């Protein structure tokens, strides 16, 4: 195995395939698989749950073969070499020699044949969409995912195909985000759970260009192709809860207000909320919202804002972090809060589009 | 106590005074007197006093409030906001637009004041010079060493120069700058936390700093801020005895090439104690590293060197720290032998000097 590649054709690929890898439980898991074959260097990183594969074309002399070497050491070497460096690599038994200028690096190898390999699987649904759509879908809901919950499925993100739409759902038990976006193709109905780390990789591989995303989904896997990267993840086995089941029945009490005015008042109020419980109270009345927080020292914050509202007056408490998370993920001009009563969750949406909705439970 | 003041005029004062365990140490002392608002923060070891002018109706008085909360509130208000503040028994009410806040207070009397003391040594210098002096040597301070007197920086006055020296027993940094004033010869040790805070009040503009040094205290005045720190009470080593007495072997090298070769080679050094071996020979330097994996790095660099060949190891971070402090075209390394420390300087300046012990590999 031999190749010589210019630094910058190696770097971005090396970073992408390092993404699944911290502290490797076993040595081979900290390695990348390098393969030269029919004119192409493939780089593969895995954590056993997912794989990221990069392909780099080789325009300079090369010879086939395969080995594995430490991912971070090799990345840091290529990164630290000077701009435009030629990186000449050759497998030499138990070492892989890397040379560039008068820099020389000897990396210890482990057999390519020992590198872990995701099992072959079959595609069942396929579609293409813009990267901006996939980014939109993920950033809309990602924050609502659970973090290291014993209920393993909540640590992921639900991906769901219905009619002409791709949808994401995330929840942690206390709050929910769902976001549907259309993609100009009719589709079958699959409902799959992507693991937290896969959602991060998916996001990581969107460059913000005009290469579209090809998605493939099987019973137990998901694959995304962007440009010269192929990301494949095992799917999480479980039942994600049902979003239709938890949206509010009849929240015909509608408050409309500026997203940023609301965010900043909630932000200011939160400063004097309970440090642990983060509760604030909202008083709604004709065209007016009042937000108050207090903490056990009897410090108090009050914010008054003009809003659009015709309903009966009411009063309700929310965890201000959850509201702020929602308003931060909204990044729109106006928000719609759809209330029922002081003991019922609120549904929050961009006032100008129902493509996303958020459910937050009330607190006493 | 009541004042109404532009959010605009409180931001930078609050940022400065929220820099310096006990509960009232997390509070700010606010004082209105003679048409001025004074804000003070402290950690008992140092303090920062900021002053704001008050043109709008105001009432004299004083109290203390949670520093981070008062800061986050004022900062959280919208740009252009007016902030009306009034003391009201055991609470301070803050108001702006239709936002209202009541913060808990502690009595202004209970707020600690650093004991009064007397100035013995005084001088003015540009902010820029003080920043250069601190930047040159800051990284060589000890962090949490039993030898308390290394956990900080020597400020020395000699001739018409201010000098800083810092060291952790393994590497040492010295920098001197002329301030155009005849000074008595005098040495004090500023605690590192004090050095860090002094640096953060230096915005890098045109503005002289005024320094006042007491037997146990240092004070700096710039603009509308007054920073005061206690000194550290011990015996700082003498940089003159640390400089190698005749480092006869002199090598010059490109700063950045040296740095990148050090940084790259270190990738394959020991993760816990990162060191590289240097083999100096006729106009050539080779840097090598090894690790328990039996992995090896080698960099060869063109350098300027004639004189006896030798192999000597160095700690990577000590050298990198020096080369980053230097940020110049070429560095000179003045070597003695394989067992002795080395002196490093900017090849085109003696303003600063670094001494680094060798590492056995
Ligand atoms: O680098 N040195 O050789 C060095 C640094 C600090 C020191 N303090 C006392 C001796 C000494 C030496
Ligand atoms: Ca109010």
UniProtKB/Swiss-Prot annotation, chain A:
Residues at which DNA binds: 23, 72, 148, 152-153
Disulfide bonds: none
Region of interest (2), ranges: 128-242
Short name of one Pfam family: DNA_pol3_beta_2
InterPro entries: DNA_clamp_sf (IPR046938), DNA_polIII_beta (IPR001001), DNA_polIII_beta_C (IPR022635), DNA_polIII_beta_cen (IPR022637), DNA_polIII_beta_N (IPR022634)
The keyword Cytoplasm appears for this protein: yes
Keyword Cell wall biogenesis/degradation in record: no
GO process terms (BP): bacterial-type DNA replication; DNA damage response; DNA strand elongation involved in DNA replication; DNA-templated DNA replication; error-prone translesion synthesis; negative regulation of DNA-templated DNA replication initiation; regulation of DNA-templated DNA replication initiation
Subcellular location(s) of the protein: Cytoplasm
Region (1): 1-119
GO cellular component, one term: cytosol
Region described as 3: 244-364
Effect of mutating residue 134 to L: 3-fold reduction of synthesis of beta*, probably due to loss of its start codon
GO MF annotation: an example: 3'-5' exonuclease activity
Main location: cytoplasm
Biotechnology: Small molecules can bind to the hydrophobic cleft and inhibit binding of various protein factors, suggesting this may make and attractive antibiotic target.
Note: The temperature- and UV-sensitive allele dnaN159 does not grow at temperatures higher than 37 degrees Celsius. The global SOS response is chronically induced. The UV-sensitivity of dnaN159 is dependent upon Pol IV (dinB), it has an enhanced Pol V-dependent mutation rate (umuC, umuD), and is absolutely dependent on the polymerase activity of Pol I (polA) for viability.
Family indicated by similarity: Belongs to the beta sliding clamp family.
Its job: Confers DNA tethering and processivity to DNA polymerases and other proteins. Acts as a clamp, forming a ring around DNA (a reaction catalyzed by the clamp-loading complex) which diffuses in an ATP-independent manner freely and bidirectionally along dsDNA. DNA bound in the ring is bent 22 degrees, in solution primed DNA is bound more tightly than dsDNA, suggesting the clamp binds both ss- and dsDNA. In a complex of DNA with this protein, alpha, epsilon and tau subunits however the DNA is only slightly bent. Required for DnaA inactivation. The RIDA complex (regulatory inactivation of DnaA), composed of ATP-DnaA, Hda and the DNA-loaded beta sliding clamp (this protein) rapidly hydrolyzes ATP-DnaA to ADP-DnaA in a DNA-dependent fashion, preventing reinitiation of DNA replication. DnaA inactivation is stimulated by DNA synthesis.
Name of protein: Beta sliding clamp
UniProt gene name: dnaN
């Amino acid at each position: 195995m031999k190749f010589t590649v210019e630094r910058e054709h190696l770097l971005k690929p090396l970073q992408q395939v390092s993404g699944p890898l911290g502290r490797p439980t076993l040595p081979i898991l900290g390695n990348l698989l390098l393969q030269v074959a029919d004119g192409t260097l493939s780089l593969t990183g895995t954590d056993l749950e997912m794989e990221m594969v990069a392909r780099v074309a080789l325009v300079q002399p090369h010879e086939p073969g395969a080995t594995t070497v430490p991912a971070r050491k090799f990345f840091d070497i290529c990164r630290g070499l000077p701009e435009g460096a030629e990186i000449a690599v050759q497998l030499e038994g138990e070492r892989m020699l890397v040379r560039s200028g008068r820099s020389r690096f000897s990396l210890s190898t482990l057999p390519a044949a020992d590198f872990p390999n995701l099992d072959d699987w079959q595609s069942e649904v396929e579609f293409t969409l813009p990267q901006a759509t996939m980014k939109r879908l993920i950033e809309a809901t990602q924050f609502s995912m659970a973090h290291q919950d014993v209920r393993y499925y909540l640590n992921g993100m639900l991906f769901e195909t219905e009619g002409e739409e791709l949808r994401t759902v995330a929840t942690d038990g206390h709050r929910l985000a769902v976001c549907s976006m259309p993609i100009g193709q009719s589709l079958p109905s699959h409902s799959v759970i992507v693991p937290r780390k896969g959602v991060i990789e998916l996001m990581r591989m969107l460059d913000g260009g005009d290469n579209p995303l090809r998605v493939q989904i099987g019973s137990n896997n998901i694959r995304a192709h962007v440009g010269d990267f192929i990301f494949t993840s095992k799917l999480v086995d479980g039942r994600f809860p049902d979003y239709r089941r938890v949206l509010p029945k009849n929240p015909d009490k509608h408050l409309e207000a500026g997203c940023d005015l609301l965010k900043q008042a909630f932000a200011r109020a939160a400063i004097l909320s309970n440090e642990k419980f983060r509760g604030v109270r909202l008083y709604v009345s004709e065209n007016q919202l009042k937000i108050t927080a207090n903490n056990p020292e009897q410090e108090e914050a009050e914010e008054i804002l003009d809003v659009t509202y015709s309903g009966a007056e009411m009063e309700i408490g929310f965890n201000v972090s959850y509201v702020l998370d929602v308003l931060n993920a909204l990044k729109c001009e106006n928000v719609r809060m759809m209330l029922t009563d002081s003991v019922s969750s609120v549904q929050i949406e961009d006032a100008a589009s129902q493509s996303a909705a958020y459910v937050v439970m009330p607190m006493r």
